[PDB]
Design a protein around this ligand. Structure first.
Ligand SMILES: CSc1ccccc1CC(=O)N1CCc2nc[nH]c(=O)c2C1
Ligand SMILES: [Zn+2]
Length: 140
């Protein structure tokens, strides 16, 4: 579990969104595993606006933050999980690292701010849903 809290937005994995998220929906995209809902309180996270390929992510199944090198956001085939069939997920970045299903939502960050959230795992890889192209998170 986990979310990004930027401005009056809450960014979560679409597959972990609650009824309150769907009832206060701003935007969702199944191909990216992302959903954004509106918040009453302002958040403290800042979004990175960059092409970094090194950063640090939080792994809840180890209570640890790990430094990683990660690929550029791409269209990647992901095997079937409890939430999606085997399919192509877009705007996904891969790194070598530990990730169990419940690790989804953990933040990946670089020197500029939040880069994305854990979305996929298995085979000793971790995948992150990028948010750096969502410029509108910084306004309204
Ligand atoms: C944090 S997500 C996670 C973590 C550990 C295990 C499973 C998940 C869900 C997930 O994304 N799967 C299902 C398992 C799987 N196995 C091999 N290759 C893959 O591409 C996948 C994709
Ligand atoms: Zn960066």
């Amino acid at each position: 579990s986990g979310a990004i809290y930027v401005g009056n937005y809450r960014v979560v994995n679409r597959h972990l969104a609650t009824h309150n998220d769907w009832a206060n929906l701003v935007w969702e995209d199944s191909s990216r595993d992302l959903l954004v809902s509106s918040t009453t309180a302002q958040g403290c996270d800042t979004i990175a606006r960059c092409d970094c390929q090194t950063g640090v992510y939080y792994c809840s199944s180890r209570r640890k933050h790990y430094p990683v090198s990660f690929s550029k956001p791409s269209l990647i085939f992901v095997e079937a999980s409890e939430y999606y069939p085997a399919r192509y997920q877009s705007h996904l970045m891969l790194a070598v690292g530990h990730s169990e299903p419940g690790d989804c939502g953990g933040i990946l960050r670089c020197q500029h701010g939040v880069v994305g959230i854990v979305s996929t795992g298995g085979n000793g890889l971790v995948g992150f849903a990028d948010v750096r192209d969502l410029l509108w998170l910084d306004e309204e």
